[PDB]
């Protein structure tokens, strides 16, 4: 049964990077930073930094992918986009 | 500085990896970009008749700014002001008096193409401004001739959005000043005299001289090295 791709599940899936998070939310760095305070969603340290970053040890901030799945709905984000259109 | 050495590279022609340069001359642009550019070029390279390129002789910077200083004092009335004067006349039509004759005469520009062509041949227009960039040019290609015929002060302006700004559209393609207030008669007179001295006289050549027989860059350098 379909040998399974050594870099998908576990630590590699539990966390997401800051750049990946912002690219997924599609807002900007400043808006991400304000929303992560209004909630607020804090950074986490993984128990296998090499098993999360897929091979590496580069200073980075990880963020609990489920926290950001809950943050995606967030009726404040649409208010931010409405302010952009008004501008 | 003991540990820091000097290891210059030899970008050469045989030993290096050539550094990153600005290759924006050889970008393979999208089709619509290529097409708009090549249309511009193909129009610069060909001889054009004298009725086209009778544009490209517009009001210069100072006189355009001076023309618009006056034309902006006559912006047509908008939606909110319309509803407000409608509310005022709504009050006055029955209470004190109004037959649509309580509010004074309005003075604003005239900006329709059919309207301004019918305002000439009356003749009441005092100054006609004609945008120089209409994509189907044959819409305006005949206005200067009729203007000179009927004796109206025409002037060709750089930009049609610029015109649309003082009319509250996006583009307007013509504008006309037909009647001005009392304080602006000297302004309008001096302005039409300026347009006379700068557009009517500076351009006696325009009637002749098919324009556009311009060579490229490489072709020009070729001919200039030959002769």
């Amino acid at each position: 049964m379909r040998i399974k791709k050594k870099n998908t599940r576990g630590n590699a899936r539990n966390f997401i990077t800051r750049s990946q998070a912002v690219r997924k939310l599609q807002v900007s760095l400043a808006d991400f930073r304000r929303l992560c305070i209004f909630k607020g969603i804090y950074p986490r340290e993984p128990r296998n930094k090499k098993k999360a970053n897929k091979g590496s040890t580069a200073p980075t901030t990880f963020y609990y992918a489920k926290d950001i799945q809950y943050l995606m709905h967030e009726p404040v984000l649409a208010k931010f986009r409405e302010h952009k259109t008004f501008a | 500085n003991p540990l820091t050495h000097s290891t210059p590279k030899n970008f050469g022609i045989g030993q290096a990896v050539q550094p990153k340069r600005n290759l924006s001359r050889y970008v393979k642009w999208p089709e619509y970009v290529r097409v708009q550019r090549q249309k511009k070029i193909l129009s610069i390279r060909l001889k054009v008749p004298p009725t086209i390129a009778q544009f490209q002789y517009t009001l210069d910077r100072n006189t355009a700014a001076e023309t618009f200083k006056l034309f902006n004092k006559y912006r047509p009335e908008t939606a909110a002001e319309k509803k407000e004067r409608l509310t005022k006349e709504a009050a006055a039509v029955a209470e004190g008096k109004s037959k649509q004759d309580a509010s004074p005469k309005p003075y604003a520009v005239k900006y329709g193409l059919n309207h301004v062509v019918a305002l000439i041949e009356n003749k009441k227009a005092k100054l006609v401004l004609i945008a120089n960039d209409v994509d189907p040019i044959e819409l305006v290609v005949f206005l200067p001739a009729l203007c000179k015929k009927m004796g109206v002060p025409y002037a060709i302006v750089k930009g049609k959005a610029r015109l649309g700004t003082l009319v509250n559209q996006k583009t307007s393609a013509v504008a006309a000043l037909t009647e001005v207030r009392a304080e602006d008669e000297a302004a309008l007179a001096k302005l039409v005299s300026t347009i006379d001295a700068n557009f009517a006289d500076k351009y006696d050549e325009v009637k002749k001289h098919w324009g556009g027989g311009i060579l490229g860059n490489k072709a020009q350098a070729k001919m200039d090295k030959r002769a």
Partner: protein, 193 residues
């Protein structure tokens, strides 16, 4: 008149090494020279000459970029090949037609500069340069059939003669050797009058 549709009159392409072509004429090839190493000489199913794997570097990126020449008689694994305008005159270098003196001999010469080789490509063959024409740069050659043609002086060609010369001396002696010879080219054998 049946070979046109191409149901069974195509070519057999499973064991063929690839298209034998010179390099793409880029900046270094047209301004200076460039070096490569010959790494292996191999049989190609269907031809008569042995191919050659030349490995150059990439001038624009950290990479290697390997080509397939047609070996000239004399080259050997480990040899340095030079390609450009400033290349020397040794067996194996590819040079522009204008920079070889008359009387010399090239092979796999281009036809319109930048098409990667048309003339004198089969085993044994070569093409003599008989003269130049500097004003209005042109060059006169002598093809194998005996024709005397004239082409541009920026068309490349590799110095020497093509390897494997002599292939048509030994008789085939057998229907079986013609069978095994044309088994790898197309469907033309046996014939009908």
């Amino acid at each position: 008149q049946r070979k046109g549709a191409g149901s069974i009159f195509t070519s057999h392409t499973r064991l063929r090494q690839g298209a034998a072509k010179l390099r793409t004429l880029d900046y270094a090839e047209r301004h200076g020279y460039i070096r490569g190493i010959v790494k292996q000489i191999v049989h190609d199913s269907g031809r008569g000459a042995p191919l050659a794997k030349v490995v150059f570097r990439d001038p624009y990126k950290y990479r290697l970029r390997e080509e397939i020449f047609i070996a000239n008689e004399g080259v050997h694994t480990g040899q340095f090949i030079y390609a450009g305008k400033k290349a020397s005159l040794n067996v194996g270098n590819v040079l522009p037609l204008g920079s070889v003196p008359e009387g010399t001999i090239v092979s796999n010469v281009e036809e319109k500069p930048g098409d990667r080789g048309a003339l004198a490509r089969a085993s044994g063959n070569y093409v003599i340069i008989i003269g130049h024409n500097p004003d209005e740069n042109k060059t006169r050659v002598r093809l194998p059939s005996g024709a005397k043609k004239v082409i541009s002086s920026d068309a490349r060609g590799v110095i020497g003669v093509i390897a494997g010369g002599g292939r048509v001396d030994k008789p085939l002696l057998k229907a079986g050797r013609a069978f095994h010879k044309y088994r790898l080219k197309r469907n033309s054998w046996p014939k009908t009058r």
